[PDB]
Amino acid sequence: PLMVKVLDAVRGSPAINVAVHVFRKAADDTWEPFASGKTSESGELHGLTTEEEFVEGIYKVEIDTKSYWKALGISPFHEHAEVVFTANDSGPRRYTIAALLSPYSYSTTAVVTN
Amino acid sequence: PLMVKVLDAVRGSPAINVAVHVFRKAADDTWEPFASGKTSESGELHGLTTEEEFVEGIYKVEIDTKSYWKALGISPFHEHAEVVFTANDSGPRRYTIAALLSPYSYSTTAVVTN
Amino acid sequence: PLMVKVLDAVRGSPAINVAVHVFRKAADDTWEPFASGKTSESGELHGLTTEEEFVEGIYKVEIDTKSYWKALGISPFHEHAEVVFTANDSGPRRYTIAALLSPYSYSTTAVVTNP
Amino acid sequence: PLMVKVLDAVRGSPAINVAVHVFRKAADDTWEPFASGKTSESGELHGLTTEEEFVEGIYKVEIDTKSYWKALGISPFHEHAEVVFTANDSGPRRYTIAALLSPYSYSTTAVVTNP
Ligand SMILES: Nc1cccc(/C=C/c2cc(Br)c(N)c(Br)c2)c1
Ligand SMILES: Nc1cccc(/C=C/c2cc(Br)c(N)c(Br)c2)c1
């Protein structure tokens, strides 16, 4: 129900081995850990959650862009890229959070399909 | 060897049934038709060419964004989106041209892999 | 030393009256409110801070994109757009944080200049 | 009435000394040269045309991104970035064509205002 795809605008490639952490907003307005992983060779992270666990709520997808750039020997601007959104049941069911990274910039979009 | 993927930033969806025309630059500096199609339900166009036909050269991928927006009853800015690039054999072999569309803006990137 | 510029990719216009909240990470790892404002008719927000006040640190610029889209009567995807960065750690710089907004997407960039 | 602004997503800076060529589609469907220039130290190019000269038509703004990246000794993907649009067809407008450049990617947006 939740996939993350990360691309590198400098090299024209998937962004491989990027750490991604997903959080769900709690009752008390704190962010609790939900799911995490590292992007694959294709820049994707699947298997984060199941339909059962992925209930409506506010989620945060934190992409560790700073470590990615440092590993390539490049100095970046951002600490991370943050994507914060509400999951809504009356919308389509599958969510892809995509991000396109540069050292001083990033783009993100949502592809929400049935 | 050549794929095109188009996404809609307004609706958060693949951009379906978008016309795409690919041209190769000729000897005489004109653009000759090479391949075309319409994006699928997943916003993708595959099957444009074969390894045999896709030789080094300058290519132009023209995405008919104006018709896409008009079909959705939205007034757009651009006539089309143009992506012009050199195919180079010493680089990886598979090229994905991706575009993310809004009515007054678009993003494009290349994912070139082996 | 800190300016924010926001554009609307749907309308082809500045994004006007966008709320922006800036935080700075404290010693204790909490996010302390630092400054806030709204974009002008030109999509810009100046006057957030001073060179004296804008010390080294980790800053978070939260752009209230959901409130913007909803005020236009549109239902967007994201809650906000958050831009988090270390500033002034090699001395004072001038930062422009720019953002380009669509209902299901945004991009952001930084322009950093050394006065 | 026509301005071009270019930023560099790698450096976090204006994209300086970027060549830009503007064409206008002629009666005979050819692209006629209209104006040209280079971005300044601020990444901007003004002075391309006048309200008198900038009549209705289909315009192409070609941003010479390959020449920019190569002048910095980098091998980029795209030949250029081309922005094609109808202008002034409901009367005179002011157009800003903005672009944000990376070696394998770019984004472009338009800001259109009615003076
Ligand atoms: N599923 C799939 C497969 C291959 C490529 C993509 C690209 C997504 C994507 C995201 C952002 Br953000 C921008 N700006 C761009 Br242009 C493209 C998606
Ligand atoms: N007028 C003005 C002054 C200073 C900065 C800007 C930035 C514009 C801009 C264009 C694109 Br294309 C993207 N993706 C992003 Br983000 C921002 C505009």
3-class secondary-structure state, position C67 = helix
Which candidate, D96, A81, B9, places its Cα nearest to that of C106?
B9
In the sheet that A19-25 helps form, which strands lie side by side, from edge to edge? A31-38, A19-25, A57-63, A78-87, C78-87, C57-63, C19-25, C31-38
3-class secondary-structure state, position C68 = helix
Which candidate, B51, B62, B63, places its Cα nearest to that of B87?
B51
What's phi and psi for C69, nearest 5 deg? -70, -45
Q: Which amino acid is at A33?
A: P
In angstroms, the CA C108 to CA A105 distance is: 6
Ligand nearest to the CA of A96: 1
Instruction: Please check whether residue D4 is in contact with residue D50, taking contact to mean a CB–CB distance below 8 angstroms.
Output: no
CATH number for D1-115 (one of 2.60.120.200, 3.40.50.300, 3.40.50.2300, 2.60.40.180): it is: 2.60.40.180
In angstroms, the CA D71 to CA D15 distance is: 12
Atom 6 in ligand 2: residue holding the nearest Cα: C98
Strands A57-63 and C57-63: unpaired
Find, in chain D, the residue whose alpha carbon is nearest to that of B80.
D84
Cβ-based burial of C27 (10 A; exposed 0-12, middle 13-18, buried ≥19): exposed
In angstroms, the CA C112 to CA C18 distance is: 22
DSSP β-bridge partners for residue A95: A2, A112
Instruction: Please check whether residue B65 is in contact with residue B81, taking contact to mean a CB–CB distance below 8 angstroms.
Output: yes
Q: What's the gap between Cα C105 and its chain centre?
A: 16
In angstroms, the CA A77 to CA A67 distance is: 11
In angstroms, the CA D51 to CA D92 distance is: 7
Q: Which amino acid is at C15?
A: A
In angstroms, the CA A35 to CA A97 distance is: 14
Q: Within 10 Å of residue B68's Cβ, how many Cβ atoms? A: 23
Instruction: Please check whether residue B81 is in contact with residue B94, taking contact to mean a CB–CB distance below 8 angstroms.
Output: no
Which candidate, C94, C98, B76, places its Cα nearest to that of D100?
C98
Which candidate, B84, B5, B106, places its Cα nearest to that of B48?
B5
Contact B85 D77 (CB under 8 A): yes
Q: Within 10 Å of residue D91's Cβ, how many Cβ atoms? A: 8
In angstroms, the CA D77 to CA B85 distance is: 6
Contact C104 B10 (CB under 8 A): yes
3-class secondary-structure state, position D50 = coil
Cβ-based burial of C19 (10 A; exposed 0-12, middle 13-18, buried ≥19): middle
What are the angstrom distances between the C-alpha of A70 and each of A10, A75, B58, C2, D115? 14, 6, 33, 25, 46
Contact D107 B110 (CB under 8 A): no
Would you state the structure tokens that stand for residue D88, as one six-digit string? 């002034």
Instruction: Please check whether residue B106 is in contact with residue B100, taking contact to mean a CB–CB distance below 8 angstroms.
Output: yes
D108 alpha carbon – ligand 2 mean position (Å): 9
End-to-end CA distance of chain C: 9
Task: Provide CB contacts within 8 A for C65, sequence distance 6+.
Answer: C18, C76, C78, C79, C80, C81, C99, C101, C106
Give resolution in angstroms. Answer: 1.4
Q: Within 10 Å of residue A75's Cβ, how many Cβ atoms? A: 10
Instruction: Please check whether residue D107 is in contact with residue B101, taking contact to mean a CB–CB distance below 8 angstroms.
Output: no
Contact A107 D104 (CB under 8 A): no
Residue of B3, B4, B109, B113 to mutate, ligand 1, most atoms within 8 A of C-beta: B109
DSSP summary character for residue B66: H
Which candidate, B34, B23, B37, places its Cα nearest to that of B83?
B23
3-class secondary-structure state, position B95 = strand
What's phi and psi for D65, nearest 5 deg? -65, -35
In angstroms, the CA D63 to CA D80 distance is: 6
Instruction: Please check whether residue D62 is in contact with residue D23, taking contact to mean a CB–CB distance below 8 angstroms.
Output: yes
Where residue B93 falls (left for φ over 0; alpha for ψ -120 to 50; beta otherwise) is: alpha
HEC string of chain A equals CEEEEEEECCCCEECCCCEEEEEEECCCCCEEEEEEEECCCCCEECCCCCCCCCCCEEEEEEECHHHHHHHCCCCCCEEEEEEEEEECCCCCCEEEEEEEEECCEEEEEEEEEC
Task: Provide CB contacts within 8 A for C108, sequence distance 6+.
Answer: A105, A106, C81, C83, C97, C98, C99, C100
Which candidate, C66, C65, C52, C44, places its Cα nearest to that of C111?
C44
The angle formed by the CA atoms of residues A12, A18 and A22, to the nearest 5 degrees, is 125
**D9-34 burial: b if 16+ Cβ within 10 Å, else e:** bbbbbbbbbbbbbbbbbeeeeebeeb
The CA distance from A82 to the nearest CA of chain C, in Å, is 6
In angstroms, the CA B26 to CA B33 distance is: 10
CATH superfamily entry for domain A1-114: Transthyretin/hydroxyisourate hydrolase domain (2.60.40.180)
**Obtained via which technique?**
X-ray
Would you state the structure tokens that stand for residue D100, as one six-digit string? 């944000």
> Residues in chain B, how many?
114
Least CB-CB distance to D9: which of C100, C109, C113? C109
DSSP letter string over C22-45?
A: EEEE-TTS-EEEEEEEE--TTSEE
Contact B13 A112 (CB under 8 A): yes
Cβ-based burial of C28 (10 A; exposed 0-12, middle 13-18, buried ≥19): exposed
3-class secondary-structure state, position B2 = strand
What are the angstrom distances between the C-alpha of C1 and each of C48, C54, C58? 8, 8, 15
In angstroms, the CA D3 to CA D6 distance is: 10
Residue D25 annotated in ligand binding: no
3-class secondary-structure state, position B56 = coil
3-class secondary-structure state, position B70 = helix
Task: Provide CB contacts within 8 A for D24, sequence distance 6+.
Answer: D31, D32, D34, D57, D58, D59, D60
What are the angstrom distances between the C-alpha of C103 and each of A107, B65, C75, D3, D36? 13, 18, 7, 26, 34
Ligand nearest to the CA of A107: 1
Residue with tokens 């216009």: C13
The CA distance from A85 to the nearest CA of chain B, in Å, is 13
| In chain D, alpha helices (H) | 65-71
The binding site of A for L-thyroxine comprises 5, 44, 107
In angstroms, the CA B95 to CA B37 distance is: 17
DSSP summary character for residue B65: H
Domain residue ranges of chain C, discontinuous segments joined by +: 1-115
Instruction: Please check whether residue A52 is in contact with residue A46, taking contact to mean a CB–CB distance below 8 angstroms.
Output: no
Instruction: Please check whether residue A76 is in contact with residue A44, taking contact to mean a CB–CB distance below 8 angstroms.
Output: no
Q: What is the CA radius of gyration of chain A?
A: 14
Instruction: Please check whether residue B110 is in contact with residue B87, taking contact to mean a CB–CB distance below 8 angstroms.
Output: no
Instruction: Please check whether residue B65 is in contact with residue B106, taking contact to mean a CB–CB distance below 8 angstroms.
Output: yes
DSSP β-bridge partners for residue A17: none
DSSP summary character for residue B32: E
